[PDB]
Symmetry: C3
Subunit: 445 residues, 3 copies
């Protein structure tokens, strides 16, 4: 609900609080069928223009079917298949003899129906397009009996419209080797997705959540090609199940913290590592290091726990006491003092070093703050942009409250001569141990 | 105009000169409107095939509108929104009461018109599609008055053509959460983009530049979904403003420089860091470290200063004197002598080590040069390919002149016993300081 | 044929064996032409609805042609053009005067024909669409002679179908600056690709290979825009030639190996580097470090040797003896004991450290194995999932046989006080040399 922020002057880091979690922990697989007709030969001696148009669209249908057939013969084994294994396990069941007839019977009278497969999975199946009925009722009388009947122009247009979804599904599945993500409206219309959300064995609060964030749901779903066999095109849609809901989530922002001496080459730097999204999860903290794995929509984060690390809840103490013995706070060291800025949720961190011109402006007043050398921060209240060198950054104009937590920059507690610079994924105590070892070589002399 | 290159044998690096800059420094936002009709209920008792086709296409229009409505209810907050903040600020203005009516009045008689918003921004708006006029004039008489009028077959076809752009715009905006880049021809036709370039408050030389590189302009633009309200679909197009033009730009290429001793494990390596694009910018140098942030078209580089670092102009002295005290030239060290090649603008750098077979061939003559162990270079004049191990590289056949700058490889100035290997983002003086400290422990003994 | 796996308990690494190679070593370029008509002015005074539809579709054709013209004026020079240089060399030939007429003559009577260009390249050309014949035969009589003839409604529909492929090709080429990959069905239909495979100067076993993996072939192909000139639209399709076939290939999986002491901060870690795909190639080993450069379909790996490194065949000895003097086995060191898992081809590696809950379950029996602290492994026979912390991984259910190679974890052979931690791309002997140097400072005291 309320977004807040905290800048820690001592460590050149900020934490954006108040976000609610939605972490993916399960998969809900569903079978999507398209009833095909298997027509073959069309003896046609008629040259009528309407007949040519029908036979042309019929060839686009036959090629789409043969393309899906050579696509299903080749079964991809790329990546670790660890995130589609649930849907892939369903495709192996669909390949069983008699199994396509079971789903074929349930969708005889209705479009949607729950089916208990021969492996105990009660999947929700769906007949989203019925080409067997259209081709066999409206098209066969036009291309059998030796000479073609003349179809009306409405039929020529109606068949291009119905056949189009088959061709586009074949188009996406061909370039992506049978596995598409996000799931497009051709694979599943918004109307079908929302109806599928309603039919899911989930809570009413979870149906409201997925229905209000369908675009994020599509981006966290998979469409897997199964089999085309016996006048049935089947493919599995894997939708996310968010097992973790409304747990506090926060985003850590970090920026280099160097000393500001006047003789260059005598300065040492330090940067907190593991910036990104953190969410409370089952007595621990789920950390997401990669930037593209979490979508945020209005204070709710939607993450996939597949690309997370599980950390003890004491990892949060790097935000209140970085020198705290319960968790070994990770840092990186260097002597590379290049200016930069980080746009946070409610403001901007600015690390200004050397001769760089760093400033913060309001659109109508101009420069309202000039940063000096070191690491500093400014809230978005009254600030529109931040300029660092030749680069202009826009501050997020989101409502919230920032808190500037003053403190001595910790880089000032380190003697430069014995500082271990050039270390990457190092801990606070690792740096201290290298300092205790470098102090013993001077102790003897 | 004239592309030139310089290979520095001493540092196993090359610089491609003669490129002209175009750096993005501003945004030009523009509002694109599509006039919708808001039709609701269609009482139809007619089963005529033309009437069915019209009602089917009308349902595809109503679903596209409801999809855009649930897309605008959910307002994405992903990334730092720092590069769309200008267009996002316009969407907040469009949400003001009475503001959609202002743009609604200016586009009453013409398609394009400049509008001064209630926040001082004079945006260029555009009515690119008029569905309210088509639906209300050609379609309502067909689906009101209790029984349907029969439309001619030309109307069935004309409505599928007009409604198509709405459906494709809804398709792109749904899978991308309202923010698309590059900007497609559905969001803005080439005809509309070029007319928008002509109508921009920019110089005539800048209009000629953006019009001759429209594909790069699309790739550096954003299309942001605003609001659908009161028979208006509005979305913001953010086009790049290139504040830096025709400044010299150059590309640094680097490759590992190792020693070539005959006993493996006794060799030390060194590689210049910060390879990429450099452009002179406002008395400093704008550096672009990531590879996908700069598009080159005929000697002009098109960069976004958002992903640049601002460096002092002395950074260029690493190209003429790497041991120069005005700038601390950055390197990385190791003992990893694996062969590789870098295809430059006018030739190829080859780092050959161990037993690797390195060569340069002409298509009809065969092998014309065999590289020995170390770092070397060959121009594209007479060379077509370069082979390193089991890999074949093609040399760019672009016209230009290469200059081979001979010099002693600097890795030979380092005593191996005290060389600091295994260092990554290290400076020349950092390595020298580790060498002065390792020489003091031998001095005492 | 038979997939096997080997987990090495001593190094916390696994090797998936039995895969067959298909490495790209060459390019087969081919010219794809679309015959255009160059119609200009359409004097039309008729307001007939069929005439409007024809003139509307004719404007979509003229804009597609002018868009391809401004696309070919701007010739992109992005990337190093090292992987399209073969097709780009063909575009420079097509720009020669008289050269478009040569391909224009061979495709006068047939759709496909081999053409010897004026640079010695015998390319296979193709007339995939004939718009000059359709526009000049069916459309000109409708828009010349001062007043328009009335076309039948079949012609209105037939022209939207034929013109569609031109518009989609223009759509893809515009957003991608003339170079598209993978190659879509609009650039080349599956029917045209398979016919092109049949017409290629390759072995019959190679035609069967590319035809059974057309989707991988598309993903490893390029479509390059050449020229639109003199009623000809020409573009080059670059298809992969797999010069390395059926050589053994294997995939190395690595995971951190730490000590399991009870006092945290007293533990040291080690991880094998260079995980990925290895294939025997011409007496050496071709290594692929990036994850997206190799597609696997049923035991065959399809790699591009462009993004490989050539290593001596002794690199495989890191899998049988990591302490072996023929190859300096690379590792990275640290003290960062965070739990993780790696899903391999036939099982899962689990590195469990600290308080993390690590387990392996069967869908119906529940937890069947609890991992203790250290690095361990489980086969997919009887295991469905592996849980580490708050993350659930799915094991690949592929048939094969795993071999658990027991051995002492090599991290136990290192004295912690003198262990060099914090090293990244370091060799076994590099770590040993840092240990021999740290042992001399204690020897004197
Ligand atoms: C460094 O030495 C002091 C004095 O013995 C000790 O109190 C401190 O804990 C040591 N720190 C580390 C990280 O070894
Ligand atoms: C190393 O020592 C010499 C001799 O005192 C000095 O002249 C040189 O500048 C030193 N270099 C560094 C990088 O400390
Ligand atoms: C370390 O020292 C021993 C004893 O002299 C020697 O046998 C061994 O090979 C040395 N190892 C390295 C990597 O220097």
């Amino acid at each position: 609900q309320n977004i807040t922020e905290e800048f820690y002057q001592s460590t050149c880091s900020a934490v954006s609080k108040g976000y609610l979690s939605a972490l993916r922990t399960g998969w809900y697989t569903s079978v999507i069928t398209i009833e095909l007709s298997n027509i073959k030969e069309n003896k046609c001696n008629g040259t009528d223009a309407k007949v040519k148009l029908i036979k042309q669209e019929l060839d686009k249908y036959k090629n789409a079917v043969t393309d899906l057939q050579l696509l299903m013969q080749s079964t991809p084994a790329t990546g670790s298949g660890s995130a589609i294994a649930s849907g892939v396990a369903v495709c192996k069941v669909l390949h069983l003899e008699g199994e396509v007839n079971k789903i074929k019977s349930a969708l005889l009278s209705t479009n949607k129906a729950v089916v208990s497969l021969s492996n105990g999975v009660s999947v929700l199946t769906s007949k989203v397009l019925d080409l067997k009925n259209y081709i066999d009722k409206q098209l066969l009388p036009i291309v059998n009996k030796q000479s073609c009947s003349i179809p009306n122009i409405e039929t020529v247009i109606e068949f291009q419209q119905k056949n189009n979804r088959l061709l586009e599904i074949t188009r996406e599945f061909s370039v992506n080797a049978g596995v598409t993500t996000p799931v497009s409206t051709y694979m599943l219309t918004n109307s079908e997705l929302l109806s599928l959300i309603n039919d899911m064995p989930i809570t009413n609060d979870q149906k409201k959540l997925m229905s209000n964030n369908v675009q994020i749901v599509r981006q966290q779903s998979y469409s897997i090609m199964c089999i085309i066999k016996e006048e049935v095109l089947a493919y599995v849609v894997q939708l996310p199940l968010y097992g973790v809901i409304d747990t506090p989530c926060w985003k850590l922002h970090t920026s280099p913290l160097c000393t500001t001496n006047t003789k260059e080459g005598s300065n040492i730097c330090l940067t907190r590592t593991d910036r990104g999204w953190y969410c409370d999860n089952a007595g621990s903290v789920s950390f997401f290091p990669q930037a593209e794995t979490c979508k945020v929509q209005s204070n709710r984060v939607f993450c996939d726990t597949m690309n997370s690390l599980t950390l003890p809840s004491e990892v949060n103490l790097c935000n209140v006491d970085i020198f705290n013995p319960k968790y070994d706070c990770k840092i990186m060291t260097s002597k590379t003092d290049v200016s930069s800025s980080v746009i946070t949720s409610l403001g901007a961190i600015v690390s200004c070093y050397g001769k760089t011109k760093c400033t913060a402006s309001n659109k109508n007043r101009g420069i309202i703050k000039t940063f000096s050398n070191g690491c500093d921060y400014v809230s978005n209240k009254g600030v529109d942009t931040v300029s660092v060198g030749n680069t202009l950054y826009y501050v997020n104009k989101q409502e919230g409250k920032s808190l500037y937590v003053k403190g001595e920059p910790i880089i000032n507690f380190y003697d430069p001569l014995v500082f271990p610079s050039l270390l990457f994924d190092a801990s606070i105590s690792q740096v201290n141990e290298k300092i205790n070892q470098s102090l013993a070589f001077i102790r003897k002399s």
